[PDB]
Amino acid sequence: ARPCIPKSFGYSSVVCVCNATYCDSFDPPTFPALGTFSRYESTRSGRRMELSMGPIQANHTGTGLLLTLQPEQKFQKVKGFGGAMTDAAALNILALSPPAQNLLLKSYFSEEGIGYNIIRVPMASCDFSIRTYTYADTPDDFQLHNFSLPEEDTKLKIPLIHRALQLAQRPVSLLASPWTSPTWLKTNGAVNGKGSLKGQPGDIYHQTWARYFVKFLDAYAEHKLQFWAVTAENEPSAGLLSGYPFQCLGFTPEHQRDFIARDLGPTLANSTHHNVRLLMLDDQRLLLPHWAKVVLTDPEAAKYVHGIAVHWYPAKATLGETHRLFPNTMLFASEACVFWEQSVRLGSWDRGMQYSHSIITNLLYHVVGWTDWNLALNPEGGPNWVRNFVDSPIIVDITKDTFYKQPMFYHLGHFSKFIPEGSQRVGLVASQKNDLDAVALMHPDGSAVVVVLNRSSKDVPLTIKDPAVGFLETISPGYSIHTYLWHRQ
Numbered sequence: 001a002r003p004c005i006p007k008s009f010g011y012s013s014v015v016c017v018c019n020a021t022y023c024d025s026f027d028p029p030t031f032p033a034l035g036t037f038s039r040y041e042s043t044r045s046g047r048r049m050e051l052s053m054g055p056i057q058a059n060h061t062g063t064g065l066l067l068t069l070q071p072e073q074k075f076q077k078v079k080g081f082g083g084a085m086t087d088a089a090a091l092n093i094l095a096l097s098p099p100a101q102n103l104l105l106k107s108y109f110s111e112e113g114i115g116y117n118i119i120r121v122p123m124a125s126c127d128f129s130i131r132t133y134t135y136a137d138t139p140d141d142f143q144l145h146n147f148s149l150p151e152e153d154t155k156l157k158i159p160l161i162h163r164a165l166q167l168a169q170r171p172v173s174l175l176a177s178p179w180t181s182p183t184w185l186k187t188n189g190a191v192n193g194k195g196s197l198k199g200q201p202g203d204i205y206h207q208t209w210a211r212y213f214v215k216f217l218d219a220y221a222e223h224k225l226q227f228w229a230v231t232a233e234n235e236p237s238a239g240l241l242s243g244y245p246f247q248c249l250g251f252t253p254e255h256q257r258d259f260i261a262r263d264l265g266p267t268l269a270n271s272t273h274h275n276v277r278l279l280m281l282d283d284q285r286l287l288l289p290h291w292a293k294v295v296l297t298d299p300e301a302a303k304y305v306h307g308i309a310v311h312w313y314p315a316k317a318t319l320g321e322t323h324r325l326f327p328n329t330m331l332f333a334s335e336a337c338v339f340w341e342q343s344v345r346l347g348s349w350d351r352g353m354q355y356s357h358s359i360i361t362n363l364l365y366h367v368v369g370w371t372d373w374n375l376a377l378n379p380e381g382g383p384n385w386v387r388n389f390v391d392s393p394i395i396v397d398i399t400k401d402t403f404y405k406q407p408m409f410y411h412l413g414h415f416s417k418f419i420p421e422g423s424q425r426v427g428l429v430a431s432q433k434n435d436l437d438a439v440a441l442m443h444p445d446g447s448a449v450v451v452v453l454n455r456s457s458k459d460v461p462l463t464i465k466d467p468a469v470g471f472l473e474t475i476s477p478g479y480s481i482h483t484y485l486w487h488r489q
């Protein structure tokens, strides 16, 4: 219905300006007839998920590249796409006026937007908080009688999550991750730095930390929010590095294995939230497949682990080999973000290409879902209480009641909007060596989705063949991303 309002900030492409009364949006989707496809196009030149239609022809004539759908070659089923509701994200959204907040939330979660269905919720503070805190900072409270949610949850995070769920067509799955435990449970007595839990898996410390998970889930349940999954610890390897600046909690692979087997696994299974999935790792994929071997060879740990969470910050040696060793334990991208460059580059087409190329690689190596980091940030990449400023698909300018949708937002949306939960990745065979990145999936309803990323400068003429329908003649322009959709019957 409403097109993008472009604005350049000196980088390779434009942002889309939104405020309290205007934001670009989609109409409700349609079901075009057999023999007709839908194409959504975003380009560095300024096109933003523009919709067009064309025919799927019975015959083909030409000399160029051919991608052939192979719907019988079936792979993983998709859980979904989304981003993280951090303190920083919540503060930046709520700095807008209410009408602008809803255009922002609709941009992510509505069918007028790109249809997110995953929200990652940090358990207490991380670096994208304005202060250090946990849910139980009074010491010597091993039964956790003084566990409580601060204003960050009750005032900022939870109300925004409620509003996101109301705007969403598809069911939204919440995913929780802790950064640090209370400091009186740690070896170093600090929120950051090199430090693990006190003692050994099984004792009062590890039982208290595991109970902290149930107490967290109880609190959000009282606020009428249920979680799909929790991770065992955010980037547990970081808590083994000397003098680590952000909130952390150190686990070596065997410590995570024993903590899951003795404490976290049983405690979650004995609780009201026994259906909540447990994801391991939640860390860099270079720690794979080793981290999976350690944890998942132990059946007492493995019986509790539903999946392996990975961060994006070679895929065959990591994701592919881990799938070969443990093909029934799903892989899930739980966090991705973007030395000499500033933290926020308003309008960077490169960082958008980085997002879509990575999602394509993850999908081509069995990953069932991808989760962004901060849903929103200010123009300097904050607030962040340490330093680590990064980019975000939506950048909020408080002083002008305005937010900007980066190219990252649309590169994500080319996947998040058209691959609902339950979609299965299927085969897509290139007729010859080419420079494009492509992935094919099938909706639960049988229709086809194909995303085509062109990171090169040259236009690439392209034909997509569906054995059941025909030939889709198209062109992939240089520095562009397309999504194609068509009924198969």
Ligand SMILES: *[C@@H]1O[C@H](CO)[C@@H](O[C@@H]2O[C@H](CO)[C@@H](O)[C@H](O)[C@H]2NC(C)=O)[C@H](O)[C@H]1NC(C)=O
Residues within 6 Å of the ligand: 005, 018, 019, 020, 021, 022
């Ligand atoms: C919010 O964004 C809208 C969209 O750009 C602004 O509406 C535009 O206002 C300018 C005046 O400078 C007109 O020339 C355009 O025709 C308007 N665009 C429309 C109606 O689509 C609006 O001004 C912005 N809000 C504020 C407070 O500046």
Ligand SMILES: *[C@@H]1O[C@H](CO[C@@H]2O[C@@H](C)[C@@H](O)[C@@H](O)[C@@H]2O)[C@@H](O)[C@H](O)[C@H]1NC(C)=O
Residues within 6 Å of the ligand: 058, 059, 060
């Ligand atoms: C698709 O077209 C095929 C080739 O067509 C033949 O070769 C070209 C070079 C022209 O000379 C054309 O006139 C010829 O008929 C056919 O063999 C095939 O049957 C066609 N199939 C469909 C479904 O249209």
Ligand SMILES: CSCC[C@H]1NC[C@@H](O)[C@H](O)[C@H]1O
Residues within 6 Å of the ligand: 126, 127, 128, 234, 235, 246, 311, 313, 335, 337, 388, 390
């Ligand atoms: C992977 S290294 C740095 C840590 C990353 N994952 C944890 C978040 O708190 C950080 O902001 C993000 O950059």
